[PDB]
Scaffold this motif. Sequence first.
Motif, short mmCIF file in Angstrom:
data_model
loop_
_atom_site.label_atom_id
_atom_site.label_comp_id
_atom_site.label_asym_id
_atom_site.label_seq_id
_atom_site.Cartn_x
_atom_site.Cartn_y
_atom_site.Cartn_z
N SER B 31 0.84 -1.21 0.00
CA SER B 31 0.00 0.00 0.00
C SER B 31 0.88 1.26 0.00
O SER B 31 0.62 2.20 -0.76
CB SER B 31 -0.99 -0.05 1.17
OG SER B 31 -0.39 0.27 2.41
N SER B 35 1.38 4.21 -3.12
CA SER B 35 1.28 5.63 -2.78
C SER B 35 2.54 6.40 -3.21
O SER B 35 2.43 7.41 -3.89
CB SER B 35 0.96 5.81 -1.28
OG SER B 35 2.09 5.63 -0.45
N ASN B 38 2.70 6.77 -6.98
CA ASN B 38 1.79 7.82 -7.42
C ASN B 38 2.37 9.23 -7.22
O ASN B 38 2.32 10.04 -8.15
CB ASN B 38 0.40 7.66 -6.77
CG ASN B 38 -0.34 6.40 -7.21
OD1 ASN B 38 -0.23 5.94 -8.34
ND2 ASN B 38 -1.17 5.84 -6.37
N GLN B 39 2.94 9.57 -6.06
CA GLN B 39 3.52 10.92 -5.88
C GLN B 39 4.77 11.13 -6.74
O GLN B 39 4.94 12.20 -7.33
CB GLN B 39 3.87 11.24 -4.43
CG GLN B 39 2.65 11.30 -3.49
CD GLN B 39 2.57 10.18 -2.45
OE1 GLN B 39 3.56 9.60 -2.02
NE2 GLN B 39 1.40 9.89 -1.94
#
Lengths: 49, 49
Positions: B31, B35, B38-39
């Motif tokens: 998870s 994340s 994505n950033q």
Amino acid sequence: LQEMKDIGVQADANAEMRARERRDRLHEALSVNRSRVNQLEKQIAFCEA
Amino acid sequence: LQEMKDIGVQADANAEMRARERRDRLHEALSVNRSRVNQLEKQIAFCEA
């Protein structure tokens, strides 16, 4: 038979085929809806950039 | 015991706890990995442009 009462599922032959058909068409529909969402988010992220 | 080998699972209580712990640590790490990707993808697309 008590184990059948504990699990609490009827599991009729007719009910089994119906359940798998509905949940399988739902699994493919979820994947398609999520793919559309991801595609539209990528397009929107590109538009922002 | 033959039925337990037909379903093909060891089913030991101590192994159940160790397995769930290892999978949960990996789910949490995954998870975090999604994340981060994505950033950093946002940073990459913005900085390259």
